[PDB]
Amino acid sequence: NNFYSVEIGDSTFTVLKRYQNLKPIGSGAQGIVCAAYDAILERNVAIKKLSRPFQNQTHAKRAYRELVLMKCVNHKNIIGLLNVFTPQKSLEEFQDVYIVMELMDANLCQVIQMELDHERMSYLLYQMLCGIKHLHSAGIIHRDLKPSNIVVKSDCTLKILDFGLASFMMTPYVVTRYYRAPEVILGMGYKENVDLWSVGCIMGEMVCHKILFPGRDYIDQWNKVIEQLGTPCPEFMKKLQPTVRTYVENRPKYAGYSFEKLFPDVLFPADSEHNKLKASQARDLLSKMLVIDASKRISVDEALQHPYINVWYDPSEAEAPPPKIPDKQLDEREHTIEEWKELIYKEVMDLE
Ligand SMILES: CC(C)c1cc2c(-c3ccc(S(=O)(=O)NC4CCS(=O)(=O)CC4)cc3)ccnc2[nH]1
């Protein structure tokens, strides 16, 4: 037989014999991930087990979307597919999906605990911006970027792990909402620069080493935002639904703090003239990302062209050919369990 089984915690991993020495590196509501050695490729890989992905609509849609996008996206700043398999030998018996991926060294939560020089900080931000733009070019807006779903290597290279939001679910896993934009928090429309809000929260956290807006729920989340940045102007208020508008206008009013006070020189390398100029430019970029009103917030391309970032600019990275997404209905599906099962199985086996 071409497979063997190993127990990983309370889970059983049944994998191809080419993959050896499995070790757990991560977990989530969607599945469980092990590092492993690929004896054929002669390199380390990551293996994600998806257990019965067709069990409900939220898991099924996410799994199907993940499979399709990994098969059609190929960019250095998005985690790359190496293999997919199932150990079950028929549609009738089909249960689990295994996705094999590039293995990276660490997540951004680990990097946030470190003091970063301007070269490394700006290069990480550049790469995030290239990954995001590439997704936007294919009509994919992430909306859920956070430190835990961004990974790095010791050479400062960076990859985004996931493709973002689509959703009730029975799960012990708690949802992190600290990086979500005001327009997502308040149920407004959104465009591409929704993702720039999240990059600003991440950047701010890299500088300060603390979560900017650590809200317990969406109501607390909003409070934390206005405390730091100030109550938005009347022009923004007028874009909200009446029921939301009454709520937002009724909160206590806050003046907010200047970006000089939010992010002072002591948080940046600021010894040499070189570092002093860079600190000033870093603060300017923050001031253009952490903007409540999306109509006044910076675009992804404006961010790529910013003085802090543009030293890295390369069109083969920042202007790559868009992904060819085959499924025109990739974000608007409703199916039965047996239908999702067959759709996913066909994708894993590569059938139509
Ligand atoms: C942490 C670091 C060592 C690392 C994680 C990782 C993954 C990885 C990919 C997906 C998952 S997951 O399917 O469990 N998704 C999680 C990510 C963390 S989260 O808080 O966003 C919940 C979903 C876990 C690890 C893939 C490749 N290299 C890696 N290096």
Which DSSP string do the residues of 38-85 spell out, in sequence order?
Answer: ETTTTEEEEEEEEESGGGSHHHHHHHHHHHHHHHH---TTBPPEEEEE
The catalytic residue among 96, 144, 162, 195 is: 144
Q: Which residues contact 37 (CB under 8 A, 6 or more apart)?
A: 19, 20, 21, 43, 44, 45
Residue 62 beta carbon below 6 angstroms from any ligand 1 atom: no
Residue 172 and residue 74 in contact, taking contact as beta carbons nearer than 8 Å: no
Q: Are 156 and 120 in contact (CB under 8 A)?
A: yes
CA-wise closest residue to 181 among 296, 292, 346, 264: 292
In ligand 1, which atom is closest to the CA atom of 27?
Answer: 14
What's the CA-to-centroid distance between 27 and ligand 1, angstroms?
7
Q: Which CA distances in Å does 223 have to 183, 226, 237?
A: 14, 5, 15
Measure the N-to-C terminal CA separation of the chain; round to a whole number of Å: 27
CA distance 275 to 280: 9
Counting atoms of ligand 1 from 1, which one is nearest the CA of 32? 14
Ligand 1 pocket check: which of 22, 101, 151, 153 to mutate, most ligand atoms within 8 Å of Cβ?
Answer: 151
Total Cβ atoms within 10 A of residue 140: 21
Place of tokens 């009347």: 234
Regarding the beta carbon of 164 and ligand 1, being less than 6 Å apart is answered no
Each residue of 315-346: b (16+ CB within 10 Å) or e? eebbebeebeeeeeebeebeeeeeebbbbbbe
- Could you give the CA distance from residue 53 to residue 59 in angstroms, rounded to a whole number? 5
What tokens were used for 56?
């409900």
If you ran DSSP here, which 8-state letter would residue 176 be given? P
Q: Which amino acid is at 37?
A: Y
Residues 6+ apart with CB under 8 A from 150: 107, 108, 128, 158, 159, 160, 161, 202
CA distances from 27 to 77, 149, 267 (A): 21, 11, 33
Protein residue closest via CA to atom 29 of ligand 1: 104
161 Cα nearest atom in ligand 1: 9
Residues 6+ apart with CB under 8 A from 167: 58
**Calpha distance 310→232 (Å, rounded):** 30
Chain breaks in the chain (C to N over 2.5 A) after: 166
Domains and CATH numbers, the chain: 1-105 (3.30.200.20), 106-320 (1.10.510.10)
In this structure, what token pair is assigned to residue 182?
């005001």
33 Cβ inside 6 Å of ligand 1: yes
Solved how? X-ray
**Residue nearest ligand 1's atom 17 by CA:** 149
In this structure, what DSSP letter does residue 1 have? -
Q: Which amino acid is at 335?
A: H
Assess whether 144 carries a catalytic annotation. yes
Q: Which pair of tokens denotes residue 351?
A: 């059938």
Say how many Å lie between the CA of residue 231 and the centre of ligand 1: 36
* CB proximity list for 104: less than 8 A, separation 6 or greater: 46, 79, 151, 152, 153, 159
User: Is the CB of residue 150 below 6 angstroms from any atom belonging to ligand 1?
Assistant: no
Ligand 1 atom nearest the C-alpha of 25 is: 3
The angstrom resolution of this structure is 1.9
Helices (H) and strands (E) in the chain, counts: 13, 10
DSSP annotation string for 294-350: TTTSPPHHHHHTSTTTGGG--HHHHSPPPP----TTTTS----HHHHHHHHHHHHHT
Residue 213 near residue 221 (C-beta atoms within 8 A): yes
Phi, psi of 40 (to 5 degrees): -85, -55
Q: For residue 160, which amino acid is it?
A: I
Which residue among 23, 33, 169 has the greatest number of ligand 1 atoms within 8 angstroms of its CB, and so is best to mutate?
Answer: 33
Binding site annotation covers 27? Answer: yes
31 is annotated as contributing to ligand binding: yes
Q: For residues 327, 83, 172 and 128, what is the CA-based torsion angle, rounded to 10 degrees?
A: -70
Residue from 301, 285, 337 nearest 118 by CA: 285
